């Protein structure tokens, strides 16, 4: 039903100074927190109004684990560089993600603890949350460290106990922003590409959250391979945009229907190009 996420990116800059650490936190598709080690005042900062009300202990706590993770990933970047036998002249990336998915009953649907090195999967917590998957031989060093610390059990307790409690806190404080579902505003645009062909583009605007499904059908049969999609994009006001397009023969436009699925709609919508 809802999700709480922590994202971190550690990027080394050989010769240009120490690695940069950028961390952000999301409730679903809304980013309420950020941390940047390059700021003059590297503290955790509110990105949304409803989290600005938190007291001083919250900001010392959030800035606390942001700085600690920044330190952790800086040491990890130099350790990974050695274990992979890589040159110190090159730049490398360490990404990580953790958080919980909470169901409508308030319980844990899924936990996540995972890292990626140079954009490739490195190590991840499995679904049972008692075990790890190491991507390569080097990652087995981290796995054995995790097992010696019994770290899966420690983080499972956070996922079950506090992660859900933090998410409930945010969903209450951010109730107006977080608990909304804005349905899409949908329409079909017609763009002739030639004398015998035209583009039918199905637009979806102003919808939240970002998850949506736009499909094209011809006489009821979905055109999976012939449909062009764009990455769902933020409008900047807290909503999202997407479109799906298909190239159709001129004069056959009426055989085609767009289908819009979004959780903000009472049910799926069907659209035709209206001439």
């Amino acid at each position: 039903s809802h999700s709480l996420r922590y994202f971190s990116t550690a990027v080394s800059r050989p010769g240009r100074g120490e690695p940069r650490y950028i961390a952000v936190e999301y409730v679903d598709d809304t980013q309420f927190l950020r941390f940047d080690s390059d700021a003059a005042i590297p503290r955790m900062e509110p990105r949304e109004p409803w989290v600005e009300q938190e007291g001083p202990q919250y900001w010392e706590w959030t800035t606390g684990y942001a700085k600690a993770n920044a330190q952790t990933d800086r040491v990890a970047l130099r350790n990974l560089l050695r274990r992979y036998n890589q040159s110190e002249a090159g730049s490398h990336t360490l990404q990580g993600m953790n958080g919980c998915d909470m169901g409508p009953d308030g319980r844990l649907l899924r936990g996540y603890h995972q890292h990626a090195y140079d954009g490739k999967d490195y190590i991840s917590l499995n679904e049972d949350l008692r075990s790890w998957t190491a991507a390569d031989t080097v990652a087995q060093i981290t796995q054995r460290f995790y097992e010696a610390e019994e770290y899966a059990e420690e983080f499972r307790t956070y996922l079950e106990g506090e992660c859900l409690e933090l998410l409930r806190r945010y969903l209450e404080n951010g109730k107006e922003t977080l608990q909304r579902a804005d349905p899409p505003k949908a329409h079909v645009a017609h763009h002739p590409i030639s004398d015998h062909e035209a583009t039918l583009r199905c637009w979806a605007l102003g919808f939240y959250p970002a998850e949506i499904t736009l499909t094209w059908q011809r006489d009821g049969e979905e055109q999976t391979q012939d449909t062009e999609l764009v990455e769902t994009r933020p409008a900047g006001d807290g909503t999202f945009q997407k479109w799906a397009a298909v190239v159709v023969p001129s004069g056959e436009e009426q055989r085609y229907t767009c289908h819009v699925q979004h959780e903000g709609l009472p049910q799926p919508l069907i659209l035709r190009w209206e001439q």
């Binding site: 606390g64 684990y65 942001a66 600690a68 952790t72 990933d73 990580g96 981290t142 995790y146």
Partner: peptide, 7 residues
Amino acid sequence: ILRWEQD
């Protein structure tokens, strides 16, 4: 405070 560990 405290948060994940990466070794």
